[PDB]
Amino acid sequence: KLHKEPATLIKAIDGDTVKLMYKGQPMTFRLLLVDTPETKHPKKGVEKYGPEASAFTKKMVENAKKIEVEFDKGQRTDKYGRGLAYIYADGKMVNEALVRQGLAKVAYVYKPNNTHEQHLRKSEAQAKKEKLNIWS
């Protein structure tokens, strides 16, 4: 089963990345299963909806009373040393919130890090159907 652990916000970097204090040490986390338009896109720089997704994540984490991280069942860090997790702000998953609002698409999935895949896919379908942001 997956479990949530406490963390403290250090800084929001982009729509899909946040820096947190986790077990007494600073770490950068990449949100699992979602792709947001980026402001620090490696080739493109700032993409359309990049600034918006960035502000959404930042607001959500900065305003929270409690942040929790939940790792999935597979690898916990990517090739850049970022933690791979679902992040929760006062019990609300940031990953799902972005998708639900049309500010992110469900990424290419790599089993076994796919626990909330179905949940996220349902939210994306609902966002497409409502023609929100990216889908407008």
Curated annotation (Swiss-Prot):
The active site is at R30, E38, R82. Ca(2+) binds at D16, D35, T36. Residues 116-136 are annotated as: Disordered. Residues 116-132 have a biased composition (Basic and acidic residues). This is Nuclease A. It is found in: Secreted. It comes from the Bacteria. It comes from Staphylococcus aureus.
